[PDB]
Amino acid sequence: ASVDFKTYVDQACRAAEEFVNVYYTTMDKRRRLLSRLYMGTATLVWNGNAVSGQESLSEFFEMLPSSEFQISVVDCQPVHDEATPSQTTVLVVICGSVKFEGNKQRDFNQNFILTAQASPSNTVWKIASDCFRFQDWAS
Amino acid sequence: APPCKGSYFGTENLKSLVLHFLQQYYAIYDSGDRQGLLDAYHDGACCSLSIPFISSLAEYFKDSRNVKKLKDPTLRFRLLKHTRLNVVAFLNELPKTQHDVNSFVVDISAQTSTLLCFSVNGVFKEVDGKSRDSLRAFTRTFIAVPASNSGLCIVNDELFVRNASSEEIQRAFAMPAPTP
């Protein structure tokens, strides 16, 4: 490979840990800014419901009740080049609990694919695809 | 508050593709020898396991990878299985299983001509070892590329294993007589 694998693994962990911190902090305390963490064409499958486009995502997020997330598990992996040619991506998987205003606290699992956007300053990671589901969605 | 729904496949063709893949994958996974999965993973595939931080999951503890808690770059690196040889060798060391495939809740969340990302939610029973008959719940996220046949070739696989809740156990094991 043109670049050492460990380099991709280290980069993936750093990008994921920092992004997760920003993501849930924003979700809970700056909801209106959350959609900016997504790519324009990004989609979200929320408990079996597909939401497409940054505009629809913004409306979806403002639609949802206030939240309080507690993240306890984060894992990530650099995505193989064959799946995303000429695009640096990282798979992130999260587990924790969340309490939406108007309902009891429940556990959830979320996974998304982050994509690296090079730019003037530092590299910016954004969600290209997202998936969220309550462990007890059926009830 | 959008109503929570079951599996999301997007299209019928993808539903058929992914469900078939899952049936074949787990037929091998639950067989007693997972080497057949070598044909399902890319030479450069990645696989990692994570479990809750908060019936014991001791057998999954050693290989659990939680980067939010584990900070060491070297340990983080070693815990990520890389190459189909290491991925499948690791999987074949995990407890033998019996997954309830037909009850899987599957979400296909990403798709391009070169990528398919889908997460699988369900339960599996351990068939032997110290936790024989225990019911575990899991969420597994796969990223696959087209395979030279019409199938899928896994490049990324993240498995999250936890204990099934009281409600999940009750629902999974129930078999009441029929009533009006």
Swiss-Prot record, chain A:
Entries under Pfam families matching the protein: NTF2
Keywords in alphabetical order: Acetylation, Cytoplasm, Nucleus, Protein transport, Transport
Record flagged with keyword Signal: no
Variant or mutagenesis effect after changing residue 133 to D: 57% reduction in mRNA export activity and loss of nuclear rim staining
UniProt modified residues of type N-acetylalanine: 1
Principal location class: nucleus
Domain called NTF2: residue spans: 15-134
Domain of life (superkingdom): Eukaryota
InterPro entries per the UniProt record, alphabetical: NTF2 (IPR045875), NTF2-like_dom_sf (IPR032710), NTF2_dom (IPR002075), Nuclear_transport_factor_2_euk (IPR018222)
UniProt xrefs under CDD domains: NTF2 (cd00780)
Subcellular location: Nucleus; Nucleus speckle; Cytoplasm
One CC-aspect GO term: nucleus
Keyword Protein transport annotated: yes
Any GO MF annotation of the entry: small GTPase binding
GO biological process, any: protein export from nucleus
Subunit structure as annotated in this protein's UniProt entry: Heterodimer with NXF1. Forms a complex with RANGAP1, RANBP2/NUP358 and NXF1. Interacts (via NTF2 domain) with NXF1. Stabilizes the NTF2 domain of NXF1 by heterodimerization. The formation of NXF1-NXT1 heterodimers is required for the NXF1-mediated nuclear mRNA export. Preferentially binds Ran-GTP. Associates with NXF2, NXF3 and NXF5. Does not bind nucleoporins (NPC) directly, its association to NPC is mediated by NXF1.
Purpose: Stimulator of protein export for NES-containing proteins. Also plays a role in the nuclear export of U1 snRNA, tRNA, and mRNA. The NXF1-NXT1 heterodimer is involved in the export of HSP70 mRNA in conjunction with ALYREF/THOC4 and THOC5.
Listed name of the protein: NTF2-related export protein 1
Species, as recorded: Homo sapiens (Human)
UniProtKB/Swiss-Prot annotation, chain B:
Effect of residue 17 to R: Diminishes nuclear rim staining and 80% reduction in mRNA export activity. Complete loss of nuclear rim staining and mRNA export activity
Localization: Nucleus; Nucleus, Nucleoplasm; Nucleus speckle; Nucleus, Nuclear pore complex
This protein's record includes keyword Repeat: yes
Keywords tagged on the record: Acetylation, Cytoplasm, Host-virus interaction, Leucine-rich repeat, Methylation, mRNA transport, Nitration, Nuclear pore complex, Nucleus, Phosphoprotein, Protein transport, Repeat, RNA-binding, Translocation, Transport
Tissue expression per record: Expressed ubiquitously.
Cellular component annotations (GO), alphabetically ordered: cytoplasm; cytoplasmic stress granule; cytosol; nuclear inclusion body; nuclear pore; nuclear RNA export factor complex; nuclear speck; nucleoplasm
Keyword Cell cycle in record: no
Record note on domains: The minimal CTE binding domain consists of an RNP-type RNA binding domain (RBD) and leucine-rich repeats. The nucleoporin binding domain consists of a NTF2 domain (also called NTF2-like domain) and a TAP-C domain (also called UBA-like domain). It has 2 nucleoporin-FG-repeats binding sites (one in the NTF2 and the other in the TAP-C domain) which contribute to nucleoporin association and act synergistically to export cellular mRNAs.
Record family assignment: Belongs to the NXF family.
Protein's UniProt name: Nuclear RNA export factor 1
Species this chain originates from: Homo sapiens
Lineage of the species this protein comes from: Eukaryota, Metazoa, Chordata, Craniata, Vertebrata
Gene (UniProt): NXF1
